[PDB]
Amino acid sequence: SDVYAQEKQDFVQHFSQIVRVLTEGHPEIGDAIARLKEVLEYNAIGGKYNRGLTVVVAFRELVEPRKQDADSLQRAWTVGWCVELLQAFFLVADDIMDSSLTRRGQICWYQKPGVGLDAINDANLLEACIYRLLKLYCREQPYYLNLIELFLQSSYQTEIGQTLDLLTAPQGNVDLVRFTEKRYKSIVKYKTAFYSFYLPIAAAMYMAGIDGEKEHANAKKILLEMGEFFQIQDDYLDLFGDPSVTGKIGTDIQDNKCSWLVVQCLQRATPEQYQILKENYGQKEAEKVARVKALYEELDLPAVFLQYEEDSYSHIMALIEQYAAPLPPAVFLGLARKIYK
Amino acid sequence: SDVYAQEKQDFVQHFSQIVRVLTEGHPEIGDAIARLKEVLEYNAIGGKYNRGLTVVVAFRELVEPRKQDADSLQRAWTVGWCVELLQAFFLVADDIMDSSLTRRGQICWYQKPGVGLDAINDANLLEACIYRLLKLYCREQPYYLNLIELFLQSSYQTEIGQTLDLLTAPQGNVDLVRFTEKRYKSIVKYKTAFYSFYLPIAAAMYMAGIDGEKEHANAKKILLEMGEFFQIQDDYLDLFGDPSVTGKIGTDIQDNKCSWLVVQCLQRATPEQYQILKENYGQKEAEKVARVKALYEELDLPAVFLQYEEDSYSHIMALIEQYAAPLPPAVFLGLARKIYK
Ligand SMILES: Cc1ccc(-c2cc3c(N[C@@H](Cc4cccc(F)c4)P(=O)(O)O)ncnc3s2)cc1Cl
Ligand SMILES: Cc1ccc(-c2cc3c(N[C@@H](Cc4cccc(F)c4)P(=O)(O)O)ncnc3s2)cc1Cl
Ligand SMILES: [Cl-]
Ligand SMILES: [Cl-]
Ligand SMILES: [Cl-]
Ligand SMILES: [Cl-]
């Protein structure tokens, strides 16, 4: 808690250097490069950097300390920042698609005067910056191609999950029949879990010389399952999370989201309850949102969640027991600690 | 003309197989994959396939015929289609950013009922498909990493050029002071020339085992210069091209575009003419567009263009003379033939 959040400070320090090298004898693109700088400064800074940091922490846990020279650690910081750029790319584009107003407390980049739909290009640049950074810092390393493929695959999985989410939850289309458990698991796995949990550990593994298919598959089984719980808790806190403790106030119900809650509610609802949901879900009427929350409450979804979090915790510890070796279980336990608070 | 347009038929034939392999034991993403199929069918088909085809023609010219087996030609078709996907990605996103209505004769993908801003994700998928295809067909080839880097770099150059264009030509901002020759050359080089002319020949070169830095630099010098002329002629035809001969009718003036014409007009205009341009450029008033065309005409810009096309043709032939070897000059002359019509 005090040692993990020290490591956070150095992470954010490295950002200036990330930006410097991404923004260098080509005079008349200078103006585009200055715009690239604003995009990076506004969109890559101001999160909690959990994904990026995971690359750094894991790399330190997986390498023998007498192969951790200044250049080694530099590359770990940089590939951490690559994960944060991938995420910035997804967020900027996602906020346009959903018509969001704010992000990380502030006006979404695309809503800023003079940006608008130009944010589409800006997001594309954020994505491109990943591969410039990999080239600049890792091109001579034996894991180079492995990291390129990892990021590309992570992008594809995320885009695919996003497609599935958009089909499943059209804004302005009350359709609870799309909102099944199988479909919810599928969205979370592709859209969130691969890039948030598998990507950063996998990156660290490759940087450490652990490139085995089986080892990667073992780590993935643990990490996708943590990803699933992360999102489910995220859906629960959207509506039941003390809002001064989380940051946010939730709009999942308004937004016709395929949330963990609605899925559970629909497995439990009578025909009558189905209709209260059907009349009220995915509307912005405060009163219509009241009566969904109330339905969820009457059905003891908070209790169902707590039961789920307990079960999920034993399942995760079992998976770690079974699939962590020959990585140190600490690699996985550090992540479990941050999400099963 | 009859032999080049035969080779076009086989190109488009291969498309079905492209789509088949991109759309395969993961049941519950099936719906996303069906959406991927529509995106590909609507946006990758219906151009003239000049960029993709250039990969195939060049590959055939650069390889010894007794290393051109069925698998070899398969990979050339596929990397051709990769160039067409990159272009589909850029077009779909560009039409959103510019608020275009039609493309290749039909309603732009994003303007279609139920798509809208979801087209941002769809465009991202088109981009992703490139690297799936490279992996599926080229992962065992020694040029694999070279092609990945080439496409990534081509994407970055294009995005950068797009940034510069957006800064230079804000819709709803009469600013002729941004519209210099240096800035115009710079936009065309990054936004158009690298991916339209350098990318497909470079791809063919790598597939042929020609990976030399110097050879690539030599080919680039010819190909960027052809790219520049292509765009300049494109700007001329927007306004002076018989519209039944081109396909289109032009909206460069309306659109506050940094066209070759406005740049030239501004090097030639008196203070008085500057004001007619300043009052009339980048407005949708038919009469205001009349009076720009008329200014261009009074300044003999059609004559200036024809002089430019002649000069450009000698310059291109000189560059080919000087920089083509040891590639067959036919590689470059085939391209010159298609654009200096
Ligand atoms: C690998 C990894 C990737 C992402 C995270 C994240 C944690 C987190 C986050 N953590 C909160 C707790 C939390 C919020 C939502 C779901 C959850 F499981 C835990 P906090 O400890 O910042 O108050 N809040 C918002 N977004 C994220 S993303 C954590 C990890 Cl270990
Ligand atoms: C490598 C390469 C890449 C792109 C092309 C293109 C030709 C072309 C194109 N060609 C017309 C001619 C033309 C149009 C605009 C500029 C120009 F130089 C030539 P056509 O022969 O289809 O009537 N029209 C619209 N877009 C494109 S893109 C041609 C080549 Cl050789
Ligand atoms: Cl080193
Ligand atoms: Cl997977
Ligand atoms: Cl073979
Ligand atoms: Cl270059």
CATH number at residue B105: 1.10.600.10
**Helix, strand or coil, per DSSP, at residue B191:** helix
Q: Solving technique for this entry?
A: X-ray
**Helix, strand or coil, per DSSP, at residue B102:** strand
By the 10 Å C-beta count (0-12 exposed, 13-18 middle, 19+ buried), B340 is classed as middle
User: How crowded is the C-beta side of B145, counted as CA atoms within 13 Å?
Assistant: 13
Q: For B295-304, which contacts have Cβ atoms below 8 Å and span 24 or more sequence positions? A: B295/B265, B295/B269, B296/B239, B296/B261, B296/B265, B299/B264, B299/B265, B299/B268, B299/B269, B299/B273, B301/B261, B301/B264, B301/B265, B301/B268, B302/B236, B302/B240, B304/B264, B304/B268
Residues 6 or more apart whose CB falls under 8 angstroms from that of A151 comprise A82, A86, A130, A131, A134, A199
Phi, psi of A244 (to 5 degrees): -80, -10
Q: How far apart are CA B215 and CA B146, in angstroms?
A: 14
Judge contact between A49 and A84, C-beta under 8 A: yes
Neighbours of B284 (CB within 10 A): 10
B247 Rama sector, left if φ>0, alpha if ψ -120 to 50, beta otherwise = left
Residues 6 or more apart whose CB falls under 8 angstroms from that of B202 comprise B150, B216, B219, B220
The conformation of residue A47, written as its DSSP 8-state character, comes to S
By the 10 Å C-beta count (0-12 exposed, 13-18 middle, 19+ buried), B271 is classed as exposed
Give the per-residue SS3 of A172-194: CCCCHHHCCHHHHHHHHHHHHHH
Residues 6 or more apart whose CB falls under 8 angstroms from that of B188 comprise B161, B227, B228, B231, B232
| DSSP, residue by residue, B157-180 | HHHHHHHHHHHH--TT---GGG--
Q: Which of A94, A140, A20, A131 lies closest to B120, judged by CA?
A: A94
Judge contact between B86 and B154, C-beta under 8 A: yes
Judge contact between B55 and B80, C-beta under 8 A: yes
Question: Is B186–A28 a contact, with Cβ atoms under 8 angstroms apart?
Answer: yes
State the amino acid at position B299 in one-letter form: L
Ordered alpha helix ranges (H), chain A: 7-13, 15-22, 30-44, 50-62, 70-98, 119-138, 144-168, 181-188, 199-207, 213-240, 243-246, 260-268, 271-280, 286-298, 301-323, 330-339
Q: How far apart are CA B254 and CA B98, in angstroms?
A: 12
Phi, psi of B46 (to 5 degrees): 115, 0
Residues 6 or more apart whose CB falls under 8 angstroms from that of A32 comprise B160, B161, B163, B164, B167, B190
Q: How far apart are CA A84 and CA A43, in angstroms?
A: 10
Phi, psi of B102 (to 5 degrees): -135, 165
Give bridge partners of residue B103 from the DSSP assignment.
B106
A84 in contact with ligand 1, CB cutoff 6 A: no
Q: How far apart are CA B40 and CA B84, in angstroms?
A: 10
Question: Annotation-wise, does B231 bind a ligand?
Answer: yes
Q: Which two tokens stand for residue A138?
A: 């890792």
Q: Which of A1, A8, A11, A50 to mutate to test the pocket of ligand 1 (most atoms within 8 A of CB)?
A: A50
By the 10 Å C-beta count (0-12 exposed, 13-18 middle, 19+ buried), B270 is classed as exposed
The conformation of residue B196, written as its DSSP 8-state character, comes to I
Phi, psi of A43 (to 5 degrees): -105, -25
Integer CA distances (angstroms), A16 to A21, A22, A293, B105, B210, in order: 9, 10, 44, 46, 38
Integer CA distances (angstroms), A26 to A23, A32, B41, B195, in order: 11, 11, 39, 18
Q: Which of B182, B97, B190, B177 lies closest to A32, judged by CA?
A: B190
Nearest atom in ligand 1 to the alpha carbon of residue A229 is 18
A103, containing H or E segment: strand A102-103
By the 10 Å C-beta count (0-12 exposed, 13-18 middle, 19+ buried), A249 is classed as exposed
State the amino acid at position A272 in one-letter form: E
State the amino acid at position B23 in one-letter form: T
Using an 8 Å CB-CB cutoff, list chain B residues near A132: 156
Q: How far apart are CA B228 and CA B219, in angstroms?
A: 14
Q: How far apart are CA B226 and CA B323, in angstroms?
A: 13
Q: How far apart are CA B9 and CA B2, in angstroms?
A: 11
Give bridge partners of residue A107 from the DSSP assignment.
A102
What is chain B's length? 341
Helix crossing, A181-188 with A260-268: angle to 10°?
A: 170
Give bridge partners of residue A103 from the DSSP assignment.
A106
Phi, psi of B106 (to 5 degrees): -130, 170
Phi, psi of B95 (to 5 degrees): -70, -35
A107, containing H or E segment: strand A106-107
Q: How far apart are CA B156 and CA A133, in angstroms?
A: 12
Judge contact between B336 and B316, C-beta under 8 A: yes
The conformation of residue A170, written as its DSSP 8-state character, comes to -
Question: Is A28–B183 a contact, with Cβ atoms under 8 angstroms apart?
Answer: yes
Ordered alpha helix ranges (H), A169-270: 181-188, 199-207, 213-240, 243-246, 260-268
Distance from the Cα of residue A251 to its chain's centroid: 18
Residues A8, A35, A37, A98: which is the catalytic one?
Answer: A98
Candidates B23, B39, B98, B124: best to mutate against A (most CBs of A within 10 A) is B124
Q: How far apart are CA B250 and CA B233, in angstroms?
A: 13
A102, containing H or E segment: strand A102-103
Q: How far apart are CA B66 and CA B272, in angstroms?
A: 66
Q: Which two tokens stand for residue B239?
A: 């306004």
**Helix, strand or coil, per DSSP, at residue B6:** coil
Buried b (16+ CB within 10 A) or exposed e, A14-24: bbeebbeebee
Residue B286 sits in which domain range?
1-341
Using an 8 Å CB-CB cutoff, list chain B residues near A152: 128, 131
Q: How far apart are CA A204 and CA A80, in angstroms?
A: 9
Give yes or no: A185 in active site.
no
Closest CA in chain B for residue A148: B148
CA angle B262, B266, B271 (to 5 degrees): 135
CA angle A260, A261, A265 (to 5 degrees): 120
Q: Which two tokens stand for residue B317?
A: 């032939």
Residues 6 or more apart whose CB falls under 8 angstroms from that of A155 comprise A86, A127, A195, B124, B128
Of A29, A120, A148, the CB nearest to B97: A120
Give yes or no: A234 in active site.
yes
Q: How far apart are CA A310 and CA A117, in angstroms?
A: 44
Q: Which of A275, A259, A179, A193 lies closest to A229, judged by CA?
A: A193
A199 Rama sector, left if φ>0, alpha if ψ -120 to 50, beta otherwise = alpha
Q: Which two tokens stand for residue A167?
A: 């089909």
Buried b (16+ CB within 10 A) or exposed e, A94-109: bbbbbebeebeeeebb
By the 10 Å C-beta count (0-12 exposed, 13-18 middle, 19+ buried), B35 is classed as buried
Specify the number of domains making up chain A. Answer: 1
Q: How far apart are CA B324 and CA B326, in angstroms?
A: 6
Helix crossing, B30-44 with B15-22: angle to 10°?
A: 160
Ligand 1 atom 10: residue of nearest CA: A339
Give bridge partners of residue A102 from the DSSP assignment.
A107
Give bridge partners of residue B106 from the DSSP assignment.
B103
Nearest atom in ligand 2 to the alpha carbon of residue B196 is 3
Residues 6 or more apart whose CB falls under 8 angstroms from that of B305 comprise B232, B233, B236, B240
Judge contact between A327 and A210, C-beta under 8 A: yes
Q: How far apart are CA B43 and CA B84, in angstroms?
A: 10
State the amino acid at position A8 in one-letter form: K
Q: How far apart are CA A135 and CA A3, in angstroms?
A: 31
Q: Does B286 touch chain A (CB under 8 A)?
A: no
Q: How far apart are CA A81 and CA A138, in angstroms?
A: 13
Strands (E), chain B: 102-103, 106-107
Q: Which two tokens stand for residue A281?
A: 């879900």
Q: How far apart are CA A77 and CA A60, in angstroms?
A: 11
First-to-last C-alpha distance (Å) of chain A: 12
Q: How far apart are CA B247 and CA B105, in angstroms?
A: 8
Count of H helices and E strands in chain B?
16, 2
Q: How far apart are CA A299 and CA A240, in angstroms?
A: 14
Judge contact between A233 and A192, C-beta under 8 A: no
